[PDB]
Write a protein that binds this ligand. Sequence first.
Ligand SMILES: OC[C@H]1O[C@@H](O)[C@H](O)[C@@H](O)[C@H]1O
Ligand SMILES: OC[C@H]1O[C@@H](O)[C@H](O)[C@@H](O)[C@H]1O
Ligand SMILES: OC[C@H]1O[C@@H](O)[C@H](O)[C@@H](O)[C@H]1O
Ligand SMILES: [Mn+2]
Ligand SMILES: [Mn+2]
Ligand SMILES: [Mn+2]
Ligand SMILES: [Mn+2]
Lengths: 344, 340, 344, 343
Amino acid sequence: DLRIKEIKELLPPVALLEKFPATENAANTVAHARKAIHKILKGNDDRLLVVIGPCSIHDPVAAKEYATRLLALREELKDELEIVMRVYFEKPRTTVGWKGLINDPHMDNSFQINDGLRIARKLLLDINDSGLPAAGEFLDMITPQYLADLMSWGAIGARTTESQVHRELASGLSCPVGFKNGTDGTIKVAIDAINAAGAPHCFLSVTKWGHSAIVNTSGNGDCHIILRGGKEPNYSAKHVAEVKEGLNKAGLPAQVMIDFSHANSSKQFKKQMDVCADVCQQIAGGEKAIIGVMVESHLVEGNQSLESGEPLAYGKSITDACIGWEDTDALLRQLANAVKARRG
Amino acid sequence: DDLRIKEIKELLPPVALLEKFPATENAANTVAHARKAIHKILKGNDDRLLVVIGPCSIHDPVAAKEYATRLLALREELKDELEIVMRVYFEKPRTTVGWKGLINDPHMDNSFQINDGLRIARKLLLDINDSGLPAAGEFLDMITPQYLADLMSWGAIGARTTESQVHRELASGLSCPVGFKNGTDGTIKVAIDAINAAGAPHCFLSVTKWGHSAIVNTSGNGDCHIILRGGKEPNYSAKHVAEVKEGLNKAGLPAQVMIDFSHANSSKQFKKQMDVCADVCQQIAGGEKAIIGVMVESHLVEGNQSLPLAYGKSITDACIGWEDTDALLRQLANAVKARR
Amino acid sequence: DLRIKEIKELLPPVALLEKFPATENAANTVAHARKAIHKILKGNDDRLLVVIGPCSIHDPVAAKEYATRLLALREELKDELEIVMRVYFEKPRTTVGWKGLINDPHMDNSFQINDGLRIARKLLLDINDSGLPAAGEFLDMITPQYLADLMSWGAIGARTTESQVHRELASGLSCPVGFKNGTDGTIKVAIDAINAAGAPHCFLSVTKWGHSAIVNTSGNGDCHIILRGGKEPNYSAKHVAEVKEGLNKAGLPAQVMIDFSHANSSKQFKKQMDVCADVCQQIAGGEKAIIGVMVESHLVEGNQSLESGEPLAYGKSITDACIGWEDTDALLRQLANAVKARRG
Amino acid sequence: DDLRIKEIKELLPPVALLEKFPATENAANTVAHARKAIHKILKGNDDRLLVVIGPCSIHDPVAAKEYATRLLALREELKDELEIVMRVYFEKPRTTVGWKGLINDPHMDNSFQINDGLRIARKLLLDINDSGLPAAGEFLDMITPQYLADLMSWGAIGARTTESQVHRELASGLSCPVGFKNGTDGTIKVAIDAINAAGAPHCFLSVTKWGHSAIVNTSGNGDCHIILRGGKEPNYSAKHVAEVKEGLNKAGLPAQVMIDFSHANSQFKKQMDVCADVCQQIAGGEKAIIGVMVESHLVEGNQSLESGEPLAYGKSITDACIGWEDTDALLRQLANAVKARRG
Ligand SMILES: OC[C@H]1O[C@@H](O)[C@H](O)[C@@H](O)[C@H]1O
Ligand SMILES: OC[C@H]1O[C@@H](O)[C@H](O)[C@@H](O)[C@H]1O
Ligand SMILES: OC[C@H]1O[C@@H](O)[C@H](O)[C@@H](O)[C@H]1O
Ligand SMILES: [Mn+2]
Ligand SMILES: [Mn+2]
Ligand SMILES: [Mn+2]
Ligand SMILES: [Mn+2]
C-alpha cells in the first residue's frame, strides 16, 4: 500500500442514525413522498414531480430559509405539483474545487468528513421534519447508508449511469431513482440502467455498522430517465417523442423527467425559464409522459466563487448558477397552471 | 429503511484471506518485477511491449492453471520482446444483467457464494504468481480489491466505469499501474480525465483490510495510461493512434497507448483480433513507439458458450484459441524486433 | 457454539457518545471531581470522599429525584465532604439474579441491552450535567467505553478484585479506582490489585468502535482499598490499624475507604448508621487514614422483590436494602461534623 | 478521556486465525470424542478417570509436540482406565507481574506480539488435536477463547476468577466441560456458586469471531465440576473429599471432584505423594474422584527466564513439574487404581 498515505476513523452510520433519528414527522414525510412519487410513476396520479433547489448546499442556514419558502409553495400547489427539495451536497467535477458539504463542510480543504456527515444528516432531518421531502444524489456506495432513509427520491450521478456498481446500488434503494441520459443525448445507457436496477442483485456493501457484508436486493421498479441534454438541449416535443418511442421499444413506461438546467439550458441559469415555457406548453397541450422536472434554484440567483480570507453572499450558489426565488415562484406557478390545463 | 434490501450475510474481511493465502516469496517477486517492468515501459526506458492476454473471464481454476503454464512458457521464450501478463479477470461488468464473474458467483448457479469466490480467486492468483506468471485484472468492485491487489501486477478500469469518480479514486491508490478503457461510444476524453484524476491525491470513503469503513488518503498514481478498445467503430488504426497521441500531448500526458484487440475493436468477433494484430503489428514494425502494450482475449479453445460446460471455452465473450494465441504472440514479438 | 443460543447486534460506544455527548457542565463535573479525589489521595485535602446512593439504579425518575436531594447536600457540606452519587448500572450476583439496568432495563429478562445503554448514558449525563458527580462498579469488560467519561470514581467489586482483566481495566481508567477487599475479608488481594493497577499493561480490549484491539495502559496511581467486611465486619479501629500497616508494608500510602454496607453491616441496612457512628468517632478523634466512605442509600428505606410480580414501589431498592432519605441526611451531616472536628 | 490509554494496535479477528488454521477432520473428531467422553464420566456412565496432564505453561512448541507425542503413547495404552488430555496452558496467572506467556510474549522479551502468539498457539493446538491428543486450556480472558476454544476438550477457570460473574458467564457458553478451582481458604462455596451460575443461561456482551462486540445468549453449561487445589492447606485427603461431597449433595449438585496434585496441594515431587494418596482412595472404591490434574514436563523442575542464560529444553519456565519418568509411573498408578475400583 505505497499509494495509501493515511487511514482515519469514520463514524459508523448507526452513530449518525442514533444522534439524528427521524422524528415521526420526518419519517411520515419520507413515507408519504415516496408513495406519491410511486403513484405518479405508475400513472395513477397526474400531478407533476418537481425536484427543485440549489445546485449544492454549502450553508444550512440558507437551506432552511429556502426550505421554509419552498414548503409554503408546496402546500399551495399540492393539487398540481409534488414538490421535493433538492438537497445535494457536492457538485462532481473533474476540474478542481470545493468537494462539497460532506467532504469539506468548513469550505477550507480540511476534509472534515465526520463533521460533514453530521451537518448533512441534521439538515435532511430538519427539512423532512418540517414537512418538506428531500431529493438526493448518489455518487458513491458508502454515503447513502447515512442519509438515504431521509431521501424521498434520488438521482444517480450522470457519470455513473453505465456503472454496474451504481446500478446495483439503485436496485436496493428504498426511494425512486432517476438515471440521466448520455452526454451526447442518447438514452441507451439510461435504459440499460433502468433495466439493470429493476433486477435483484447480490454484491458487497458497507452496513449500518461500518462493516462490509454481502447484500441481496429486490430490484427497484421506480427508476426512470432524466433528460438532461446532449450536445444540444433535448427538452423539446420532438426529443420527448423520440425518447417515448425508445422507452416503448424497450418495454418500459414511456415517461421522462426533464432537467431544465445545464446542457438543457445551455449553462445560463436564466434559460431554465425558457425551458419551463416550452415544457409548460407540452404539458398544457396534453403531454402525460412528462412526469417530472428538475430545477436549480436558490434564494439569490447567479453564483459566486469560494475565496480564501473572504465572507460569502448569503443564499447564493458557490457551484453552478441558479435561478433566484422570484423566478422560482413564477416557474412553480407556471408548471402548476400547465398541469391544470392538461386535466380538464 | 432497507425495504429493497432482502438479506445481509457475513463477509470474511481481507485480513482472513491474506492470512489464509499469504504471498509466497516467489509470488511477491513476480509482482514486484512485473510492476517495475511496466513502470519502465511506461517511463519510455524499455522498448518491449506489455502484453495483457488471457481469458475474458476466469470460471474454472484448473483450465486457468493449464493456460498459465502454457502462457508461462511463451512469456519466457519471448522475454526480450514482450512483457507477458495473463488476464485473470474475476469481475465482469454486464450491459444490463448476467453472470458477474467468479468472485460474485463461483458456482455459476446464482448461489452467490462470495466467501468461496474470494478464497478460490485468491488461491488461483497466488498459484499463478507463484509459478512466475504475473497477472492482470479489472477493478470493478469497490470492496474486493483489498482481497487481491497485492497479487496484481496491472489493473484496468473498464470502459463503463472510466468515468466513475470512485474508480478514479481507487486507481489513485493502487500499487500497480492502471489502464483506463475509452468510452463505449469511443470517447477518448473520459479516459484522459481519468488519467489526470488518478495521478492526483484523493480523500474518500473506503473499506480497510479489517472490513471496516474508513477515510482513506491516496498518493496518486502516475503509472496510468489509456486503452483503445473501440466505440461505434474500431479505433486501433494509425489515424486513431495519431489522434489519441495529439490528445495526450494537448493534455500534457505522455503520448502512449495500449490497444485492446478485442471487444469493439474486433466487433465482438474473436477472429478479427488476428486481423487487428496484423494491423497493429504493421504500426509497430514501422517505428510506432507510442504503442506500449496490447490486450487480447485468449483461451485454450476458441469461441464461447452459454451458461455442464465445455472445457477451455469462455462463458463470456468469445476468445481466440491457443493455436491462434501462440501465433499472435509470435507476430507481436517479431514486430517488436523490427521496431528496434 | 452449541451453548451459544443467539447473537445480536450491539450499538458501538461511538453511537452512544454521539447521541449523548457530555455538555460543558457535565465534563466540568467529571474533571473537578476526579481532581478533588486525586488531591485527597495524594494527602493534600483533608475532606472526606463520600460515595453514596442506591445499591442499584432501576428507575431514572427516582434516580434524578435522589440526585437533586444529594446535590443540595453536596453543595451545603462541600467544605467537609466531596459527595459522589452511586450510579450503579451493573450488579454482581452470588449465583443468578437481575444484573442491573444495562443488562436488563425492563427487569423482565428481555435483556434489551441497547435500550439499557441508552437509558444509562442519558441518566449519567443528566446527573453530571446537574452538577453531581457519579460513581460506578466496573464489572463488565465491554460497557466501560460507553460510560467511563462520565464516571468520577469507580469500584472493582469484592468478587473481581483478584481478577487480572479487572486490574488491567483499572490500569487504563481515567478515574480513581477503589478495590474492595475479598468476600471472606482478605486484605492482601486488594493490596495486590492496587499494585497491579498502578503498573502499565498490554491486553485485549474493545475500542470505541466496537472492535477488539490490543491496548496498552499507563497504569493508574489513583487506586486505594475499600473495606467492606468479611466473615465479620472490618470497619473498626483494630482493623483499620491492621490495613494501614499492611499498606505501608507493601509501600502504599496508609489510606482506606470504608463501605458501611454489605459485609460491614452484616447486610442489615439500618446498621450502616452504627458503622457511621463508629467511623465518625474515628475521624473526629484524628484518624487521617480514612479518606472515604461508601453508603447504600435511597429515597425510601428497605428493599422489595422483583420476583413477586407486584408493581414496584417508588424510590425503593430492588437489590440490597438501603437507608432512606431521612437517615441519609442525618448520616451526611454526621460525617461532615466528624471531618470538621478532625480538622479542628 | 483516554489519559491512561497509551496505544491501540490492530488485532487479527478470530475468523482470520480460523481461516489460516482450520480444524482438520482428525482435530475435530479428537475434540468431539474427548468432550463426549468427559460428559459420560461427569454423568456417571463411564468409570474411567479424566487425566489433564502436562506443562504448567507452554513456552516452546517444539518441546510441547515431543511431550504430546510421548503422552499420546500413554493415552492409547491406558485408554480403558484413563481419558488422558494434555495440559496446553499458554501462561501462568501471576500474583501481580512476570513473563506473560506464549500468546502475550511468544518471543519472551516483552515485545507483546499478540498476533504472533495467537497464530503460534492456534497452530500448536491444531497440530496436537490432529495427532489424536485432546487438549485442555485455562480460560483467563473473554477474548482469547474465540480464537482457540474450538480446539479445546476441557477448560479450567482460574482460581482468582472462580468468583467472577464475567467468567461464570463465559463458562455458561463454552462448548467444552469446565472445572472451577476452590478458593484458597480451601473452601468450596464460591466454586459451588460458579457451577450453579454457569449452569444457567446468561445474556451478556462478548466479542464475536468477526472481532466485533455483540449481545450473546447462552444455554448454560451442565458439564461443570469442582477442582480441589488446596489453600493454606492441602485438600486432597478422603476426609476433605467427603466434606466436599456432602457440600455438593447439600447444594443439589453431583458429588464428584477433580483433584489437582500440584500448587497448594503441593514441591513438584510431592505431586507423586498426592498420586499415592489419591490412588488409595480410588482403589478402595472412591467413585467421586472423576479426574485429576498434574503438572508435568519432559524434564523435571523449572528454571528462570530472567537470568540471561539459554534455557534448557523441555523444562518449565514457570512452576516446577515432574519429569517424564515420574509421569509414566503416575499414569500407570492411576490406571491401576481405576482397575482396582472397577473389578
Ligand atoms: O437574504 C435572502 C434573500 O432572498 C432573496 O430571494 C430575496 O430576493 C432577497 O431580498 C433576500 O431576502
Ligand atoms: O460523500 C463522500 C463521498 O465523497 C465523494 O466526493 C467521493 O467521490 C466518494 O468516494 C465519497 O468519499
Ligand atoms: O491471552 C491474552 C490474555 O493475556 C492475559 O495475560 C490478559 O490478562 C488478558 O487480558 C488477555 O490479553
Ligand atoms: Mn448543478
Ligand atoms: Mn471480454
Ligand atoms: Mn449493595
Ligand atoms: Mn501452575
